[PDB]
């Protein structure tokens, strides 16, 4: 009688089947592209004979149930909750399931976990045969229905100008189940209007898209205006089902396959220095089997005032040779896929979601890994007593200052590049001797990899 409507359907994500509370269930900001359903495998039996009386017969049997299909898209709207005062995306257990299979723990360091500054999602503890187990609850009008033991297969992140920032989720469940009784009241679990105002206070617009590309073999950072992009995280999950003739069967668990983090970035060719054309010609010139690039795509842009933004940080990526795409105005496409340091070392990449980004915050998130931990920005090597020169056979212990003063890693290395008339140790004691009449330089770079440069030309003379 009463017809169920699509627009009135609300989704609930849970980690447990009983005792649903605010810490285990949430209302998901799903769009109007929802779709789900479970199909089955069937077998037909035909008979082929040669007698005078052919047997035109066909007998059908049900054999098994395929995986339950579910897919929906949500808005990327990071925010801070009033309870914890820490930036968390509304759909945080989805990112936890995509990241690692451990118990949900925002106070840890692996998987989806927040902080006072930003919400960061790493895949360092992803090396599992089975990720975190969810339960997609589908409340269409009044009738209940949920999908048993869902697991996130992939997360489709679309980054295109003229398009608002969104993410599309698609996964599979063991068995979709319809329910008659309410598992839990949706009103108090569902987000109230105040946190809806708090969430809508932060929107991410993909029109402001700035890319950080830097090769680790040459450190040639480029300036590329983005036309449109897309990067997805794939788990390659396959459900395993038994094969029994007598009765039908349902899937039993799964085994996550190979982790894939691929992305496609479209951008216009530029003749300007460090532009798209220079990147393309450098890549098509140095044809190398292996690539090692710093790619840091920043959705929503960067600003001095706190602004909502989404960040991808791929430390050691693999850039496929670009193919310049012909159109009205030449716009090329670059394909990348983040490879790890070691196949089982994790650290494929990590993401940043928060409404409160300053350029320094995103910078230290990119270089150090967290939006809260500070990193060095500039370095000037300091002589032991404002000294400008050195004579032959004289010791000089180099000192150094770093900025900001709140940097977590402040120690720097000591090296000599230009000139051969002195030496430096781990502590910085520069030493000279006889037959040292030439000008020499001294270098200093911190171990956090900010790209900081500490330089000073000391005029080492022959002495008195």
338/332 Cα distance (integer angstroms): 20
Matching residue, tokens 């502590």: 427
User: In angstroms, rounded to a whole number, what is the distance separating the alpha carbons of residues 231 and 335?
Assistant: 10
- Minimum distance, C-beta of residue 352 to its own copies, in the bound complex (Å): 19
Nearest Cα neighbor of 335 from 363, 359, 361, 314 is: 314
**What is the nearest approach in angstroms of its own copies to the Cβ of residue 260?**
6
Cis (ω within 30 of 0) for the bond into 404?
A: yes
Q: How far is the CB of 51 from its own copies (least distance, A)?
A: 3
Q: Is 372 exposed, middle or buried (0-12, 13-18, 19+ CB in 10 A)?
A: middle
Nearest residue (CB) to its own copies, 233 versus 376: 233
Q: Based on CB atoms, which residue is closest to its own copies, 290 or 434?
A: 290
Residue nearer to its own copies on the CB measure, 244 or 462: 244
Between 184 and 303, CB nearer to its own copies: 303
Cβ nearer to its own copies, comparing 34 with 429? 34
What are the backbone angles phi and psi of residue 424, rounded to the nearest 5°?
-135, 145
Which is nearer to its own copies, 3 or 426 (by Cβ)? 3
Q: How far apart are CA 448 and CA 409, in angstroms?
A: 7
Closer to its own copies by CB, 75 or 184: give it.
75
Q: How far is the CB of 82 from its own copies (least distance, A)?
A: 20
How many of the other CB atoms lie within 10 Å of CB of 429?
14
Give min distance, CB of 324 to its own copies, in A.
17
CB of 329 to its own copies, least distance (A): 6
Taken in order 264, 266, 269, 274, is the CA torsion positive or negative? negative
Residues 6+ apart with CB under 8 A from 343: none
What kind and span of H or E run contains 368? Answer: helix 359-368
Separation CA 208–CA 185 (nearest Å): 40
3-state SS assignment for residue 446: strand
Smallest distance, Å, CB 346 to its own copies? 30
Interatomic CA distance for residues 315 and 126, integer angstroms:
17
């Amino acid at each position: 009688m009463s017809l169920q409507l699509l627009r009135n359907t609300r989704i609930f994500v849970s980690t447990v089947k009983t005792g649903h509370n605010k810490t285990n269930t949430q209302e998901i900001l799903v769009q109007d592209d929802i779709s789900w359903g479970q199909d089955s495998n069937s077998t037909d039996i035909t008979v082929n004979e040669a007698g005078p009386r052919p047997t035109r017969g066909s007998k059908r049997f049900n054999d098994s149930l395929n995986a339950a299909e579910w897919s929906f898209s949500t808005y990327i709207l990071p925010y801070k909750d009033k309870n914890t005062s820490k930036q968390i995306v509304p759909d945080y257990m989805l990112w936890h399931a995509l990241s690692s299979g451990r118990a949900i723990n925002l106070e840890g360091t692996t998987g989806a976990h927040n902080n006072a500054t930003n919400f960061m999602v790493n895949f360092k503890d992803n090396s599992y045969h089975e990720l975190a187990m969810l339960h997609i609850y589908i409340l269409t009008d009044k009738t209940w229905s949920y999908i048993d033991s869902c697991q996130i297969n992939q997360a489709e992140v679309n980054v295109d100008i003229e398009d608002i920032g969104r993410v599309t989720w698609s996964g599979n469940g063991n068995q979709l189940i319809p329910l008659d009784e309410q598992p839990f009241d949706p009103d108090q679990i569902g987000i109230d209007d105040e946190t809806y105002m708090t969430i809508q206070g932060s929107y991410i617009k993909n029109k402001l898209t700035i890319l950080k590309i830097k090769d680790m073999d040459t450190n040639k950072s480029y300036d590329i205006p983005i036309t449109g992009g897309t990067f997805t995280i794939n788990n390659n999950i396959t459900y395993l089902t038994p094969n029994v003739m007598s009765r039908v069967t349902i899937p039993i668990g799964s085994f996550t396959g190979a982790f894939e983090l691929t992305g496609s970035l479209t951008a216009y060719l530029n003749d300007k220095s460090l532009g798209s054309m220079e990147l393309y010609k450098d890549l098509i010139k140095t044809l190398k089997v292996v690539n090692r690039f710093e790619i840091a795509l920043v959705l929503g842009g960067e600003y001095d005032d706190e602004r909502p933004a989404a960040i991808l940080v791929a430390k050691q990526a693999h850039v496929n040779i670009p193919t310049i795409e012909t159109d009205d105005v030449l716009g090329t496409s670059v394909e990348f896929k983040a490879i790890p340091s070691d196949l089982d070392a994790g650290d494929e990449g990590y993401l940043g979601f928060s409404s409160k980004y300053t350029r320094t915050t995103i910078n230290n998130l990119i270089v150090n890994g967290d939006g809260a931990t500070d990193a060095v920005t500039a370095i000037t090597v300091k002589s032991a007593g404002n000294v400008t020169t050195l004579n032959r056979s004289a010791t000089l212990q180099m000192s150094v200052e770093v900025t900001p003063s709140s940097a977590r890693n402040k120690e720097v290395t000591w090296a000599i590049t230009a000139g051969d008339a002195a030496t430096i140790n781990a502590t910085g004691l520069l030493r000279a001797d006889a037959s040292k009449t030439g000008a020499v330089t001294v270098e200093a770079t911190a171990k956090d990899g900010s790209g900081v440069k500490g330089t000073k030309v000391i005029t080492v003379t022959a002495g008195g």
